[PDB]
């Protein structure tokens, strides 16, 4: 059989060993070329319990993205150790899909329960060497470029009744989020989003959040207060730190004239926070040219509140592991020998 176990996972990459893109740079030095022929062994009449909040792989993937970021991005004013003014060149930044894989003596067990919440038992199951590709995008509030749920919008948590544990919302349709910054002031950008797309789905989400809260009134509001990075929508595009006001996205009035394309007042910061550890940093004034990411929204991180006839949900974000958890939910390491 196979006992739940851990092991160091090796990364299948497609990263061509010629690009100065700092993901390619790292993923060539640390990672092998991809599998040409991924095999999947569907294990019949075998049930296995998974847990996305207690899956080891999350921490390994997390180790890498830090390592990757720490060798590739260096702050001109790194406010951690005293007076660090170390070099900050302008290098290529575009996420690439990593495959984490187990050597012989270990398998990756993949769950095929199509509407699987991430924790608890999985009846329909398989075996793999490797995961699907995963882009290590660093973001809060919205999960960009991830996966879609197979059928239904699946709501993920360790404890639904515990308002402390963050809820991962997994979409089934994707929403494009055009995030542009005009060339030639510097510190001001805009994320163009289709309104008629977003609220048709934010509703589909509400009906799902009803299903797990006894048909109570589902209500969104801007983050109750907290660091600029998790109150605003903080992510990275072409080596720049976007900070977008996502208030106009989480609208209740819509879910009625709402069709119109919504746009977020973004503004790129230099004096920023750190998601790796506690402390501040500083990077150079943003690069020139029409900066844009054609990002595809596939998830929402959410925090609840304390209970009468309504339930409040504000945008979550901070535990960047959760991002990897949203992608690694159906996989688990197992020893054979």
């Amino acid at each position, epitope marked *: 059989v196979w006992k739940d176990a851990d092991t160091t996972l090796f990364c299948a990459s497609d990263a061509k060993a010629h690009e100065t893109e700092v993901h390619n740079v790292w993923a060539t030095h640390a990672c092998v070329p991809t599998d040409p022929n991924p095999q999947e062994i569907h294990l019949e009449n075998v049930t296995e319990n998974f847990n996305m909040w207690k899956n080891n792989m999350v921490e390994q993937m997390q180790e890498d993205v830090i390592s990757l970021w720490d060798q590739s991005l260096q702050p001109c004013v790194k406010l951690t150790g005293s007076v660090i003014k170390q070099a900050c060149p302008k290098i290529s930044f575009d996420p690439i899909p990593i495959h984490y894989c187990t*050597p012989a003596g270990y398998v990756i067990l993949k769950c095929n329960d199509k509407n699987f919440n991430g924790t608890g038992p999985c009846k329909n199951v398989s075996s793999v060497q490797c995961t699907h590709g995963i882009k290590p995008v660093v973001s809060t509030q919205l999960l960009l470029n991830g996966s879609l749920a197979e059928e239904e919008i699946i709501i993920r948590s360790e404890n639904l009744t515990n308002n402390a544990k963050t809820i991962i919302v997994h979409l089934n349709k994707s929403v494009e989020i055009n995030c542009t910054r005009p060339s030639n002031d510097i510190r001001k950008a805009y994320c163009e989003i289709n309104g008629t797309k977003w609220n048709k789905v934010l509703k589909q989400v509400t009906e799902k959040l009803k299903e797990h809260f006894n048909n109570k009134t589902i209500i969104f509001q801007p983050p109750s207060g907290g660091d600029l990075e998790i109150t605003m929508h903080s992510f990275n595009c072409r080596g720049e730190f976007f900070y977008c006001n996502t208030t106009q996205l989480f609208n209740n009035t819509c879910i009625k004239g709402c069709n119109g394309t919504i746009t977020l007042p973004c503004k790129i910061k230099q004096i920023i926070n750190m998601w790796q550890g506690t402390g501040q940093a500083m990077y150079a004034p943003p690069i020139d040219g029409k900066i844009n990411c054609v990002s595809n929204i596939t998830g929402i991180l959410l925090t609840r509140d304390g209970n009468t006839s309504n339930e409040t949900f504000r945008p979550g974000g901070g535990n960047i592991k959760d991002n990897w958890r949203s992608e690694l939910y159906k996989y688990k390491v197992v020893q054979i020998e």
Partner: antibody, heavy 123, light 109 residues
Framework: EVQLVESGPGLVKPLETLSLTCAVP????????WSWIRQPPGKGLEWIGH????????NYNPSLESRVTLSVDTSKNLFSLKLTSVTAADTAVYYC????????????????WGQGVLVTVSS | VLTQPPSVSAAPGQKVTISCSGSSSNIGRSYVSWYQQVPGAAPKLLIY???KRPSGVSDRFSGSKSGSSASLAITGLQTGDEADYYC???????????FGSGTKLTVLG
């Protein structure tokens, strides 16, 4: 751009033990598989075995199974081999290589080779 | 040990093919790799997974396999190509990487 460095006695007596060093600067040692391959001067290539970075799962060349040890000092970034009761035959050029090894597709290939070390077996 | 002809030779700018005769339990199993060794340095990977080139390796080099036999097709021959060539399949009979015997590409000259 992925580096390997071999090291060894160069001259070794017969019926001794051949001790070969392969240094992998830049971490990544615990991550991948790594092989030891020899080549007699002016002759064919011979894969000896491999060892996973962590593992320590190892797979040996059955005709050399009895005499080959592969170990991975992860703290010092090293992957070395011991070869016991060496003969005149084991005189060859030795190099380590990084290994891609997906079990159940085939895909046993060496994508990153070190430069090489020559070992002479003469009493 | 896999079988391949010792000498291949042709004028510059021409196409050559390098055999690699195996069996059901190596090339009938595994993906094939090829190793270019110029004299007298260590080998480098030329082809893998039957037919894939690691960045900065001409499509002039081209991999293939047929049942229990592989080939390395080379076009646009230059002097730089003059080297030794070894195919590399995994083998579940004896659980080994079985190397091709060896072929010497000679550009004339």
């Amino acid at each position: 751009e992925v580096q390997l460095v071999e090291s060894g006695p160069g001259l070794v007596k017969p019926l001794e033990t051949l001790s070969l060093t392969c240094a992998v600067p830049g971490g990544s040692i615990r991550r991948n598989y790594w092989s030891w391959i020899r080549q007699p001067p002016g002759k064919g290539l011979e894969w000896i075995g491999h060892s996973y970075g962590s593992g320590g799962s190892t797979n040996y060349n059955p005709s050399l199974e009895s005499r080959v040890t592969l170990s991975v000092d992860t703290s010092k970034n090293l992957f070395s081999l011991k070869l016991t009761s060496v003969t005149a035959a084991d005189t060859a050029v030795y190099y380590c290589a990084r290994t891609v090894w997906y079990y159940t597709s085939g895909t046993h290939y060496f994508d990153h080779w070190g430069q090489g070390v020559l070992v002479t077996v003469s009493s | 040990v896999l079988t391949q002809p010792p000498s291949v030779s042709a004028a510059p700018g021409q196409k050559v093919t390098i055999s690699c005769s195996g069996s059901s339990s190596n090339i009938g199993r595994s993906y094939v790799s090829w190793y270019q060794q110029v004299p007298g340095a260590a080998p480098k990977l030329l082809i893998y997974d039957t037919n894939k080139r690691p960045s900065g390796v001409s499509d002039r080099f081209s991999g293939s396999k047929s049942g229990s036999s592989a080939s390395l097709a080379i076009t646009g021959l230059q002097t730089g190509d003059e080297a030794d060539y070894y195919c590399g399949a995994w083998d579940g009979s004896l659980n080994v990487h079985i190397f091709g015997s060896g072929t010497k590409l000679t550009v004339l000259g």
